[PDB]
Write a protein that binds this DNA or RNA. Structure first.
Ligand SMILES: [Zn+2]
Ligand SMILES: [Zn+2]
Ligand SMILES: [Zn+2]
Lengths: 236, 66, 97, 429, 111, 144, 48, 48
RNA sequence: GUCUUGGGUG
């Protein structure tokens, strides 16, 4: 999703010179003061109040690679940070990366991170809207109209919490549905259409994101190719 | 750029049909029906008119230099 | 296909999934078309091939240059022997036949 | 509500491209550069100072005399053209392209010269910065499609490039490993060192490298009997044991060093791997002696006495040691805690309890576009310029005259440097 | 598990009370010498298992990437448990699994 | 950046083997895959001193030396060829003289056409450079 | 692909080329004592 | 990858138990290869 | 007419 899997020079630059995917974007950098303020408000404890004799369960919080404190309960902190980012209070290009085995919470506001947009599957396990896209036909109606019914473009989608940006590090922690149909298991038998993979090992999927369209992983030059999924990759 | 006079493959004259084709497309006829009415029956002649991109309109917007 | 992400090949799989689809088995044919995951894995494999072709040719050319410089002065002489430029015998009869 | 179809997805994607286009990263990077970066680089080192107190064949009369200039705001004007007559007028990319000109804006820097004498200045033109076409400072930003046609510009042309001597130049994004992240690497068979935690440090302001600091694990598997861990401070030639730097930073009792290292006393393998360090650094018991031990290696001049060898080593431990943490004094505990975290990551990789870090992971990499690249080059060239200003105020002030500073700045340094780098590609002086 | 000093806050090292033949612990800084409980003085291991069950937190149920199994919880007969393999990372380690119930948070196994 | 050709896949006569390919001559005659080519040559006058400079001018043989082996008969009186004139290889399109430092006191610095290319002059531009000295750009055109 | 052509400038080098380097003389190779030129591409398919 | 190919005597070369005994004789084991965990105990009196 | 840099081809 970040760099084109097919566009690369032949020879000595092979693999070293890369080409951005169509929906790729580069972060501009952002001030870390609001991040620190939100962390301090919601309950982060400092390292001048740190005592590893007691803090055997605390999760350490990194901001731009700087360890700035610890928290008793990363769950509500990540929930609140993600809601703030999806409401516009935090810059949409800011990484919010929880690590669970390592008991860490890493927030990045670095410049130069590559990121890509995804649909947001409603994953809060408390409403009938769970396990489905938050984007609906009202949003598409607004996008075609060009205004809300009391300019409606891409940024309004991003700030309404139906699309968010993820860099490579945040992508580690998310569960991306490949197509909007993959969000629900079908009950077919088409000898012509390609077999969408079985995916039988996992009892219940908890998707957090969906690709807008899988063809967006390609770049400018690979996008001209017709039916590139019917070719061996060196030809692409 | 501008509609070619002949069909590349066979040589039928298609240069006199671009304006009629545009007028047919204005009044709602879909592309296949318009190409049928202009009596373009071979798919070579048809793709001559269906795939033309008229760039002279874009070139004409830059002021005459004399 | 290695676990390039943490415990998975791609972020569309779950952790510690060793099934053929997770680790780079392409079930379709070229006629049927590859899935995006299979497309990416096949791209990784083709990239490995391209890297090999681009990178091994220098070692191979160096090897052939060294072999040529080592064996360049060796000639069959009118008495049948195989000698170098110093006149030293390498084989008393060429190919032993 | 109904099911989102593929066509709905293409409507969303069309919204994305309607807003952003295809070269928005170049344009946004350059707009950030011209809005904030130049001013921040000018205020990075914002003052020059000359001084002379006394004893210049006078009548024992001594006066402290400081000559000083403070750089102020940056003024950014539209690209202009100056003819050999001296006439001026607006410059557009097509004219710059036809006559092999460079399409650049003038940069002015307010300078306010001050002097202090104790007995015991206009918009200086500092250079021309090339402008990225179709950015907020280009003269093609405010036009509509009609005027664009009248200015000989193609509406499909998206910008994102520079015009240097009438040649279109594009800045290729540079890929680099991230900053302020700990990475732990395996090592090779004929190497006593087995595991190395490497961190590069940089500041949130400027985003420039400052210092680098590895923490190696000496001792191979079954060979190299001493499995100690030794730091590598910048500006010192030989590698210091870890307990030495924990003592130098202000935690002497070995229990506290271990606790900064050990979050869980119950764990035993890591504590069993920590003893040889404690033993190889058992000699020291206070901060001064350890910090001298660091000082005795600082690669500085020979023979500094203890009291200021200590100052040199303390300066190294304060600045150039984890500047991202902080570069001010009185906050050593945070650096000690980061050292403990780094040692733990080292040991986790060494005890096979966690896999070694992935070099090729794309989340641990950054892309440097026009913004940061021009920031680096401009910082270099402007420190050149300020050094010229100092070298000039050394001479001219001797004359004891008032000077207007418009002959003190050789504006051609930044202009020639930017033009040379963008025209050749060689990123540097 | 080595202790630390009750006075000097450094670490105590082993020693011998040659006039009583009892293993003391000697401070290398101070003169304090306390009685010990365990006469063991050293250990070394090659077949270790530390890191078997340690890779679990309270909110591990909140991880949405862990695969969910239908194994019965031995504790509360709960038909929903997330599972994962041994968090030890050696080359020769098993592929045997661990099972965490979302009801009691008790970890269990299929053995 | 292409054209929809009608393609047959056949071992027709053996001239399309090993990534060769047979093309219709009649379709070529009707304009298939036909393209225009534009090459632009540049030149200007330098200042070697106070009153020592180069000049765009048709170089007469008497006052000049080391004249190129091409023909100079296409330049106007200003040392510049006019748009609309066919040009072959080795023909001079920008006449220039460099003065001899201390009659017959000039060396030439003329710009010929590339020895391989034919074509027709399209657009002879004339302006002044950054330093106010005369500047010339000559764009050639051809069809491939 | 592109290939280079060298023209011998005397009768001795002409004779050397025609009597040592000529294509018919290189049909069998000493590398694997087998031919190096075979019927290929369309003539092979067509003869089958 | 250094490697030997150890051909066995024919009487051994047909029987599998004898070949496995020769394998045991040829293979290298150190005290490391059969040791689990070493302690150090203070035992003041040898007879107790 | 020379040296470096960059983009490529088999
Ligand atoms: Zn036709
Ligand atoms: Zn003690
Ligand atoms: Zn249970």
């Amino acid at each position: 999703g970040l760099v084109c899997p097919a566009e690369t020079p032949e020879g000595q630059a092979c693999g070293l010179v890369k080409n951005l995917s169509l929906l790729s974007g580069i972060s501009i950098g952002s001030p870390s003061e609001p991040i620190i303020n939100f962390l301090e408000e919601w309950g982060m404890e400092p390292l001048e109040d740190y005592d590893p004799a007691q803090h055997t369960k605390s999760t350490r919080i990194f901001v731009n690679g700087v360890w700035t404190g610890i928290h008793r309960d990363p769950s509500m902190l990540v929930s609140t940070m993600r809601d703030l980012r999806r409401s516009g209070a935090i810059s949409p290009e800011v990484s919010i990366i929880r690590d669970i085995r390592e008991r860490e919470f890493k927030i990045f506001t670095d410049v130069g991170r590559v990121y890509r947009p995804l649909f947001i599957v409603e994953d809060d396990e408390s409403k009938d809207n769970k396990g489905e896209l938050r984007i609906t036909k009202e949003h598409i109606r607004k996008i075609q109209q060009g205004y809300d019914d009391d300019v409606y473009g891409w940024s309004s989608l991003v700030t309404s919490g139906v699309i968010e940006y993820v860099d490579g590090e945040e992508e580690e922690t998310i569960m991306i549905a490949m197509t909007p149909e993959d969000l629900q298991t079908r009950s077919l038998n088409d000898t012509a259409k390609r077999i969408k993979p079985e995916m039988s090992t996992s009892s219940h999927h908890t998707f957090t994101h969906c690709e807008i369209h899988p063809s967006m992983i390609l770049g400018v030059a690979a996008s001209i190719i017709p039916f590139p999924d019917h070719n061996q990759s060196p030809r692409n | 750029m501008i509609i070619p006079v002949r069909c590349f493959s066979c040589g039928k004259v298609v240069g006199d049909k671009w304006d009629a084709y545009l007028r047919l497309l204005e009044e709602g006829k879909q592309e296949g029906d318009a190409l049928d009415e202009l009596k373009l029956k071979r798919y070579c002649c048809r793709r001559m008119v269906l795939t033309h991109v008229d760039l002279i309109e874009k070139f004409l917007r830059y002021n005459p230099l004399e | 296909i290695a676990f390039g992400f943490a415990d998975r090949s791609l972020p569309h799989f779950t952790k510690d999934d060793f099934s053929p689809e997770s680790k780079g088995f392409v079930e379709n044919s070229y006629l049927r078309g590859l899935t995006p995951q299979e497309f990416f894995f096949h791209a990784m494999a083709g990239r490995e091939g391209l890297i090999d072709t681009a990178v091994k040719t220098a070692e191979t050319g160096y090897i052939q240059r060294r072999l040529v410089k080592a064996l360049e002065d060796i000639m069959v002489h009118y008495d049948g022997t195989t000698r170098n430029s110093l006149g030293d015998i390498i084989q008393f009869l060429y190919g032993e036949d | 509500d109904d099911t989102i179809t593929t066509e709905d997805c293409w409507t969303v994607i069309s919204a994305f491209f309607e807003e952003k286009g295809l070269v928005s990263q170049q344009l946004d990077s350059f707009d950030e550069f011209m809005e904030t970066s130049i001013q921040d680089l000018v205020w990075e080192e914002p003052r020059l100072i000359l001084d002379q107190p006394a004893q210049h064949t006078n009548e024992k009369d001594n006066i402290n005399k400081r000559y000083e200039i403070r750089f102020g705001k940056i003024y950014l004007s539209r690209p202009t053209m100056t003819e050999a007559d001296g006439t001026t007028h607006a410059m557009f990319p097509q004219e710059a392209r036809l006559r092999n000109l460079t399409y650049s804006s003038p940069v002015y820097l307010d300078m306010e010269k001050s002097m202090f004498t104790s007995i015991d200045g206009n918009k200086v033109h500092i250079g021309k910065v090339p402008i990225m076409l179709r950015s907020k400072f280009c003269s093609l930003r405010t036009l509509d499609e009609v005027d664009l046609y009248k200015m000989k510009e193609c509406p499909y042309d998206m910008g994102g490039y520079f015009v240097i001597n009438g040649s279109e130049k594009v800045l290729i994004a540079q890929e680099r490993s991230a900053a302020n992240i700990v990475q732990v690497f395996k090592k090779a068979a004929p190497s006593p060192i087995s595991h190395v935690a490497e961190i590069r440090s940089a500041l949130e302001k400027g985003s420039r490298l400052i210092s680098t600091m590895q923490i190696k694990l000496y001792g191979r598997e079954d060979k190299g009997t001493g499995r100690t861990i030794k730091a590598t401070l910048p500006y010192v030639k030989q590698d210091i044991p870890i307990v030495i730097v924990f003592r130098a930073l202000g935690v002497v009792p070995d229990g506290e060093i271990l606790q900064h290292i050990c979050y869980d006393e119950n764990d035993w393998q890591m504590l069993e791997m920590l003893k040889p360090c404690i033993e190889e650094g058992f000699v020291i018991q206070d901060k001064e002696v350890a910090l001298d031990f660091i000082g005795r290696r600082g690669s500085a001049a020979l023979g500094i006495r203890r009291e200021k060898r200590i100052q040199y080593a303390k300066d190294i431990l304060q600045k150039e040691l984890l500047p991202h943490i902080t570069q001010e004094e009185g906050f050593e505990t945070r650096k000690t805690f980061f050292l403990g975290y780094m040692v733990n990551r080292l040991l986790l990789c060494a005890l096979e309890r966690k896999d070694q870090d992935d070099r090729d992971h794309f989340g641990k990499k950054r892309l440097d576009l026009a913004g940061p690249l021009l920031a680096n080059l401009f910082r270099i060239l402007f420190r050149k310029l300020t050094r010229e200003i100092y070298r000039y105020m050394q001479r001219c002030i001797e004359t004891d005259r008032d000077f207007n500073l418009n002959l003190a700045v050789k504006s051609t340094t930044i202009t020639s440097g930017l033009k040379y780098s963008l025209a050749t590609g060689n990123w540097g002086e | 598990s080595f202790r630390f000093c009750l006075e000097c806050n450094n670490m105590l090292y082993p020693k011998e009370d040659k006039e009583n033949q009892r293993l003391l612990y000697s401070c290398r800084n101070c003169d304090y010498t306390e009685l010990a409980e365990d006469p063991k003085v050293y250990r070394h291991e090659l077949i270790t298992n530390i890191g078997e069950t340690a890779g679990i937190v309270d909110d591990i149920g909140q991880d949405p990437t862990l695969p969910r199994s239908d194994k019965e919880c031995p504790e509360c007969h709960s038909r929903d448990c997330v599972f994962f393999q041994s968090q030890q990372r050696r080359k020769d380690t098993n592929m045997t699994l661990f099972y965490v119930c979302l009801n009691c948070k008790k970890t269990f196994r299929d053995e | 950046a292409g054209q929809n050709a009608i393609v047959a896949i056949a071992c027709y006569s053996g001239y399309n083997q090993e990534d060769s390919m047979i093309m219709n001559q009649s379709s070529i005659d009707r304009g298939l895959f036909r393209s225009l080519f534009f090459r632009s040559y540049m030149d200007q006058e330098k200042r070697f001193g106070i009153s020592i400079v180069e000049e765009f001018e048709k170089p007469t043989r008497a006052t000049t030396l080391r004249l190129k082996h091409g023909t100079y008969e296409k330049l106007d009186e200003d040392g510049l060829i006019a748009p609309g004139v066919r040009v072959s290889g080795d023909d001079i399109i920008i006449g220039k003289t460099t003065p001899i430092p201390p009659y017959h006191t000039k060396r030439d610095a003329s710009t010929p056409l590339r020895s391989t290319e034919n074509g027709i002059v399209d657009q002879v531009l004339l302006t002044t450079n950054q330093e106010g000295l005369k500047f010339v750009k000559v764009r050639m055109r051809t069809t491939k | 692909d592109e290939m280079n052509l060298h023209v011998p400038q005397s009768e001795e080098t002409r004779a050397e080329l025609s009597q040592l380097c000529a294509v018919p003389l290189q049909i069998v190779s000493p590398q694997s004592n087998k031919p190096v030129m075979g019927i290929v591409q369309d003539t092979l398919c067509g003869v089958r | 990858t250094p490697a030997l190919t150890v051909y066995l005597d024919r009487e051994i070369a047909l029987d599998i138990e004898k070949a496995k005994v020769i394998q045991s004789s040829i293979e290298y084991t150190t005290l490391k290869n059969v040791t689990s965990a070493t302690e150090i105990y203070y035992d003041p009196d040898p007879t107790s």
